[PDB]
Design an enzyme around this catalytic site. Sequence first.
Site, mmCIF file in Angstrom:
data_model
loop_
_atom_site.group_PDB
_atom_site.id
_atom_site.type_symbol
_atom_site.label_atom_id
_atom_site.label_comp_id
_atom_site.label_asym_id
_atom_site.label_seq_id
_atom_site.Cartn_x
_atom_site.Cartn_y
_atom_site.Cartn_z
ATOM 1 N N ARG A 1 50.973 47.097 -27.337
ATOM 2 C CA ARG A 1 51.407 48.477 -27.559
ATOM 3 C C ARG A 1 50.329 49.370 -26.939
ATOM 4 N NH1 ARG A 1 51.518 52.004 -31.615
ATOM 5 N NH2 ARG A 1 50.954 50.683 -33.400
ATOM 6 N N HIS B 1 -28.775 56.709 -38.718
ATOM 7 C CA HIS B 1 -29.345 55.723 -39.645
ATOM 8 C C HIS B 1 -30.586 55.045 -39.052
ATOM 9 C CE1 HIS B 1 -29.516 52.440 -42.552
ATOM 10 N NE2 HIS B 1 -29.553 51.585 -41.527
ATOM 11 N N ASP C 1 -23.063 59.792 -38.889
ATOM 12 C CA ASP C 1 -24.004 58.783 -38.398
ATOM 13 C C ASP C 1 -23.985 58.622 -36.872
ATOM 14 O OD1 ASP C 1 -24.911 55.317 -39.015
ATOM 15 O OD2 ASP C 1 -26.196 57.091 -39.065
ATOM 16 N N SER D 1 -27.182 48.347 -35.068
ATOM 17 C CA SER D 1 -26.833 49.663 -35.603
ATOM 18 C C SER D 1 -27.073 50.665 -34.464
ATOM 19 C CB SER D 1 -27.698 49.995 -36.817
ATOM 20 O OG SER D 1 -27.149 51.067 -37.566
ATOM 21 N N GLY D 2 -26.106 51.549 -34.237
ATOM 22 C CA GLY D 2 -26.155 52.525 -33.151
ATOM 23 C C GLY D 2 -25.644 51.991 -31.826
#
EC number: 3.4.21.7
Length: 756
Positions: free
Chosen positions: A115, A571, A614, A706-707
Site C-alpha cells: 500500500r 619551600h 609554593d 622539590s621545585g
Amino acid sequence: LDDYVNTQGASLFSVTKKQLGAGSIEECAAKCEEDEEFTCRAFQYHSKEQQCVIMAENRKSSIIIRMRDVVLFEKKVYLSECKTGNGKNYRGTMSKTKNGITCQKWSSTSPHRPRFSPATHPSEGLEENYCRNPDNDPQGPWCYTTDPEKRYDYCDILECEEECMHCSGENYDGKISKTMSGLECQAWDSQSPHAHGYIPSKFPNKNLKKNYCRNPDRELRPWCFTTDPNKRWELCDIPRCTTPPPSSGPTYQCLKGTGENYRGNVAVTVSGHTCQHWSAQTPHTHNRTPENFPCKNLDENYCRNPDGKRAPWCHTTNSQVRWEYCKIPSCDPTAPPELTPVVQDCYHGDGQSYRGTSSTTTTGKKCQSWSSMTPHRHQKTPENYPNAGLTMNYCRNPDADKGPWCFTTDPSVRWEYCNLKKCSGSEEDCMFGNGKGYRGKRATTVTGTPCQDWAAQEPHRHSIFTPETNPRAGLEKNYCRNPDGDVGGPWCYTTNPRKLYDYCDVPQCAAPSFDCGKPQVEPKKCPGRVVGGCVAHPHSWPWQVSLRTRFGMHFCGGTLISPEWVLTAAHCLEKSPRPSSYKVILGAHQEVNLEPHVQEIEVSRLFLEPTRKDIALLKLSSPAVITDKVIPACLPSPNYVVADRTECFITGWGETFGAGLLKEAQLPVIENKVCNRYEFLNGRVQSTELCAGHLAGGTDSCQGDSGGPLVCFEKDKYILQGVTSWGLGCARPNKPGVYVRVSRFVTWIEGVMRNN
Ligand SMILES: *[C@@H]1O[C@H](CO)[C@@H](O)[C@H](O[C@@H]2O[C@H](CO)[C@H](O)[C@H](O[C@]3(C(=O)O)C[C@H](O)[C@@H](NC(C)=O)[C@H]([C@H](O)[C@H](O)CO)O3)[C@H]2O)[C@H]1NC(C)=O
Ligand SMILES: [Cl-]
Ligand SMILES: [Cl-]
Ligand SMILES: [Cl-]
Ligand SMILES: [Cl-]
Ligand SMILES: [K+]
C-alpha cells in the site's frame, strides 16, 4: 550544514553521481538537498578545483579512499542506525522484524502487494527492504514480511540519544545546553570564562560540539562548564530513554577474558563469603553502584567486572573483607605512547624509506594506528603493504605520496602529512611551519612539473587563488605559495592539464639560536609502567636546575626559563633568607661527581609569589650561557590548562639503581574535575594546582626534587606546565600528585622579568 558529517581528505567510489562547478560548500549542499535524478546521501567539495560531486552513496555502501583537495559531507540520517520518535525520518538499514523475519522489498509485490511503495510514496525513503514508517504509525518503523502469513510487522530499532539518553550519557547526542540549576553551558572549544583540559581537538572522538551537555569523563550524567565565572561546571538534567540501551555485545553465563561480559548468577566470593548487593551500602560503602554503572548489569548480588579488574568480583557481607574476586567457571586496545622525536626526524626523497617514531602531523594532530579501523576505515595494512613498515601509529608513505603521512585520530580529518623535514644531506629561500607567510622564488614541484602562473586561467581555470581574490597571499608569477593553509605546505597549479596542483619542497628556516623547550639530546621517554622511573639521557632536559647549598650539596630542583631566571618552589628557600646562600648548577647529569663544562651561577635576587603559593623566581647574578647542554624551557600561555590524559615528564635527582644520576618519570595529567572527585582529592585541588600521576597503581613516593620541573610535549617542543611541591600532595596509592600550575603564574613571572 548541521545535518552533515564532514571528513577532510576523504572520497568515495560513486557510480550514481553528478559533477558540477561550485564556489562554496553551502552551494554544493543546496544541490544535494534538491535530489534531481537520485537521493543524495553525500557530497564532495574540492576547494582549489571549485568542483562539487553529488553522490547517492556514503561510507556504508562505498569504499573510502584518501584524496587531496577534498572534504566529504555525508547526510547524518543515512549514517544513523537509530530512530527518533515514531521513526518517520529514520533512514537506517534494519531489514528484519521484531520476531526475526526478513523484510520484503518495498518495490516487490510478492508475497504481499504494498500500500506504501516508492511509486505511491516517493518522499518516504522506501529503499531496499529497510524498516520505515511511511503511514505515521505510532508504533514506529515497520516492513512487509517475507512470511506470507504475516502482512507487515514492526522492527526493533535503537532509539537515538537526541531527545533522551542511554546509560550515563557517554554517547548523548542531544542539544541541551543548560545545567540543572539553569546556568548556560560554556562552549567546549572556548577557554573563557573557565579554562579546561577537555579540549575538543585533544578529544575529537568524544563529540564535544558547541555548548551541548556531554559526558566525556565517566561522570554520573552529561555536564558542561558554565558561563557563570563562579561556577566552573555543573550536571545537566538529561531525560532517560524508556527504551532498551545499545547492545554491549555477546553475553555469557561463564567466564571469558576479564569477565566484563559475564552475566551469570554466582553470588559467592573465592573464599566462600556471601556477596553484598550492588544497591546496598552496608557493611561497605562504595561508588560501584547501578547509578554509576547503569549498563554494566549490577543486579542483585551477582559477581561482575564493571571497573576493569582481573576477573568478576563483588563486595562482601562480612565487615572484615571489603571486596574479593569470584571463582566463575571458565568456558573454552589502548592508545600508543608518545615517541615523536623532539630532535625533528628527517626523510629522504618521498620518505618511503622513513622508519622513525614520529606520530605527529604538520598541524599537531595525533596519528591513528595502521592496525586500527577507527575513526578511519582503510586498507593501508601491513598485509596489503608488507614492505612499507606500517607499525604502531608511525608516519609512513605506503602509497608513494610527496612525503610521509598518517591517518589522524580526528574523525573530521582522514589524513595529514607528518611534521618532518626533508634531509639536507638560496639559503634565505626558506619557510616557517606550513609556509603561509612564505614569499620566496621556488617554482619547482615535487614531480618536476612547471607551475602555472597564479594570474593564468590555462590549463586550469580558477575563481579562487588569483592575485585579485587573494591580494595578501603574494600570488606573484608561478611561485609556490600556501594561501589556504594547506597541510602539505606551499603549492601551485601545474602546467600539466591532468594534474590540478602539486606541492613544492620548501626547506624550514634554520633557527639562529637554541629555542626554548627543544633539547639537543633526544629524551629516553621512560614508559609510564616503570617503577622508580628511568635514568635520563645526559643533557636531554637542558632546563634542569640543581639548587645547591654553600657546602655544595644538591637539595632542590628548578627550571631555567630565561638566561637570567630560574623557577623553583618557595619551600626550597624556607630555611635561608639570603640569595647568597644558594647557587645554581646548569647542564648537569651527576648529583655529586659533576662533569667538566657545567655552569655554576650565584643567585642575586629571590622573588616569592604574592598569593603565598609554593612557587619562586631566582635572578641569577650573571646570565647563563645558552649552549647545546643549557637551554631554557618554554612557558605556557596565561591560564592554559593541559589536556586530560596528556603524558608529561617529571625530572630530578631525588632521594635514593642509577645513584646520583638525573632521572625521569612519565605521568598522565588528570583534569582538576576528575582529580577533585571524592574518591581522590575531594575538592582540595584549586585552579592554581595541577594533577599528574596514576589513579590506580600508585608508586607511594614523593617523586623528583622539590621545585623540580613537570614538562609536557606539544607538537615539536616541551613546555613547563608544573613545579614540584611535596606539600600540595605526593603520588600516593590510588591518589595522584599535586603540582603548581605554571600557566596561572606566567603573567606574574613575565612582570617580574620585565621590571627586574
Ligand atoms: C595500552 O595501555 C597499556 C597500559 O595500560 C600499555 O601497556 C599498552 O601497550 C601494550 O600492552 C600489552 C599488555 O597488555 C603488551 O605489553 C603490548 O605488546 C603487544 C601485545 O602482546 O599486546 C606485543 C605485540 O608485539 C604488539 N604488536 C606489534 C609491535 O606489532 C602488540 C600491539 O602493539 C597491540 O596489541 C596494539 O593494541 O602489543 C604493548 O604494546 C598500550 N597500547 C599500545 C598500543 O601501546
Ligand atoms: Cl586511504
Ligand atoms: Cl578522543
Ligand atoms: Cl654532571
Ligand atoms: Cl574542578
Ligand atoms: K558514570
